[PDB]
Amino acid sequence: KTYDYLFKLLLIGDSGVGKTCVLFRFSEDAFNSTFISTIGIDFKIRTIELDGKRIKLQIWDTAGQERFRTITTAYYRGAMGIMLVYDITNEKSFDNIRNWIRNIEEHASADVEKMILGNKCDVNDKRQVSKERGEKLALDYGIKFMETSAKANINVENAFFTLARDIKAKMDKKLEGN
Amino acid sequence: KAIHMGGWDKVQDHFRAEKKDHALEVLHSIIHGEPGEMEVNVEDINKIYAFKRLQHLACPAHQDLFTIKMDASQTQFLLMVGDTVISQSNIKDILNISDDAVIESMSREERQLFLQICEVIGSKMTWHPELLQESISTLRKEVTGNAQIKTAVYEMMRPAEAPDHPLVEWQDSLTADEKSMLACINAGNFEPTTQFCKIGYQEVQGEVAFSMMHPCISYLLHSYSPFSEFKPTNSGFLKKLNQDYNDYHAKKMFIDVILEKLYLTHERSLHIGKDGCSRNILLT
Numbered sequence: 001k002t003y004d005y006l007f008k009l010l011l012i013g014d015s016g017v018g019k020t021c022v023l024f025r026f027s028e029d030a031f032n033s034t035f036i037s038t039i040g041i042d043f044k045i046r047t048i049e050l051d052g053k054r055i056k057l058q059i060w061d062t063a064g065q066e067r068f069r070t071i072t073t074a075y076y077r078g079a080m081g082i083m084l085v086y087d088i089t090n091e092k093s094f095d096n097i098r099n100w101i102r103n104i105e106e107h108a109s110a111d112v113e114k115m116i117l118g119n120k121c122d123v124n125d126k127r128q129v130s131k132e133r134g135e136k137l138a139l140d141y142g143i144k145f146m147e148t149s150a151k152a153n154i155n156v157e158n159a160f161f162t163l164a165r166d167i168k169a170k171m172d173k174k175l176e177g178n
Numbered sequence: 179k180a181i182h183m184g185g186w187d188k189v190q191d192h193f194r195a196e197k198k199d200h201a202l203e204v205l206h207s208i209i210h211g212e213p214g215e216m217e218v219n220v221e222d223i224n225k226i227y228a229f230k231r232l233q234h235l236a237c238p239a240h241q242d243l244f245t246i247k248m249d250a251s252q253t254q255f256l257l258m259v260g261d262t263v264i265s266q267s268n269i270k271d272i273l274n275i276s277d278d279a280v281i282e283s284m285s286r287e288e289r290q291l292f293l294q295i296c297e298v299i300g301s302k303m304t305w306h307p308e309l310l311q312e313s314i315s316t317l318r319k320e321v322t323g324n325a326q327i328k329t330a331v332y333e334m335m336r337p338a339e340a341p342d343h344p345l346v347e348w349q350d351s352l353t354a355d356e357k358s359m360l361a362c363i364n365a366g367n368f369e370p371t372t373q374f375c376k377i378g379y380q381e382v383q384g385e386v387a388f389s390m391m392h393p394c395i396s397y398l399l400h401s402y403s404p405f406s407e408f409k410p411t412n413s414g415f416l417k418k419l420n421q422d423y424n425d426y427h428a429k430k431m432f433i434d435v436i437l438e439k440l441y442l443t444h445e446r447s448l449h450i451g452k453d454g455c456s457r458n459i460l461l462t
């Protein structure tokens with residue numbers, strides 16, 4: 001076996017909050033320097049191991065391309081997990097998270113796992129959103145939340161591992177009959 | 179390119195060159211043996227090619243204001259010049275299907291391709307009614323054989339595969355369980371030479387991702403019928419296409435694993451054939 005399952009994931013959030021940097025940190029352990037600008041880098045992959053099974057995480061980064069809540073059911077079709085990202089530098093992007101969420105509940109499947117990322121934990125001088133405000137919005141909707149920084153490589157790895165472990169969990173119980 | 183409807187071969191002589199396109203439009207309005215022939219239901223699909231005929235007579239500066247927008251219900255296409263809706267068309271009437279048939283939502287790219295396919299169908303039925311009267315197959319091979327349609331379909335589904343890509347011979351690497359898992363993408367059967375005609379693939383930075391053609395695109399290219407009689411049969415084909423579509427996405431975490439292994443063993447393609455024959459093309 002090369003790998004056992006394919007988990008399709010979506011990076012969702014406003015433009016500028018760091019979705020592409022989060023993706024390249026998780027997939028290639030990279031930030032800036034030898035720049036590769038996403039002329040069509042719609043997704044990146046990273047194969048991880050959970051409970052002896054090797055999961056290929058296929059993580060898409062197409063939000064904000066043309067998707068300013070123009071989205072319908074087709075954009076979430078096939079997605080098993082969604083990573084919602086805002087910028088703690090930017091309260092406007094944090095408030096827009098409420099919109100992205102309602103776009104998801106009304107257009108995506110109900111058994112899609114979701115997680116919220118407050119990226120740029122490393123910029124405290126320019127912070128506009130408290131961490132407790134981050135965990136309060138996530139507690140509202142009953143989905144997990146963490147703060148991250150793609151630049152300092154803080155909480156990127158364990159965020160994706162938690163989401164994938166949650167996806168594998170409910171997929172595994174579904175395979176006990178159904 | 180030669181238009182014969184309404185005796186136009188011999189009627190065009192009575193018109194100056196500057197006016198034969200206007201006259202051809204009025205001629206189409208005039209002409210479009212009842213006992214024995216089948217009724218058609220083509221009003222809503224012809225609207226779309228007719229919209230581009232209206233846009234074509236606008237100035238290149240204003241032609242960008244002619245757009246077709248889906249309404250909030252996702253059940254009609256709105257034909258819009260600027261902020262004004264000049265007409266609408268029901269998507270179920272475009273497809274000539276029953277009212278309780280299910281239309282799965284399309285991406286914006288797929289909606290564009292959907293309307294382009296409708297544009298070619300409409301033009302062939304408007305200016306060349308002789309295709310349909312011969313056969314439904316002669317009409318269909320004229321739209322699936324169209325150069326822009328073939329190119330646009332491959333660009334969207336298999337961007338790195340040429341439409342004339344040569345067959346790759348089949349190599350049975352699959353277990354029985356894997357063949358059962360794949361059966362849902364071809365109506366409950368596993369046949370190597372047809373299993374993959376609906377599967378697309380694209381590589382980003384050398385990494386392949388698989389996907390399935392939207393059922394309405396599949397239906398429009400290979401199963402569309404303008405005859406009112408075929409409305410139940412049309413809906414039967416669409417419902418079967420939807421079933422394969424929803425089955426693929428529900429089991430995509432297992433199926434894409436199997437598709438990737440076949441893709442890698444067949445020279446990064448699923449255009450697979452056996453003894454020289456394949457139906458795993460997207461359209462021909």
Ligand SMILES: Nc1nc2c(ncn2[C@@H]2O[C@H](COP(=O)(O)OP(=O)(O)O)[C@@H](O)[C@H]2O)c(=O)[nH]1
Nearest residue numbers: 014015016017018019020021120123149150151
């Ligand atoms: N200090 C800091 N800067 C970041 C971080 N993440 C992204 N940035 C920068 O914010 C800008 C936008 O990043 P990008 O990933 O392209 O945002 P996107 O539009 O959501 O894809 C870039 O200049 C990043 O280098 C972070 O975690 N910490």
Ligand SMILES: [Mg+2]
Nearest residue numbers: 019020021061
């Ligand atoms: Mg980006």
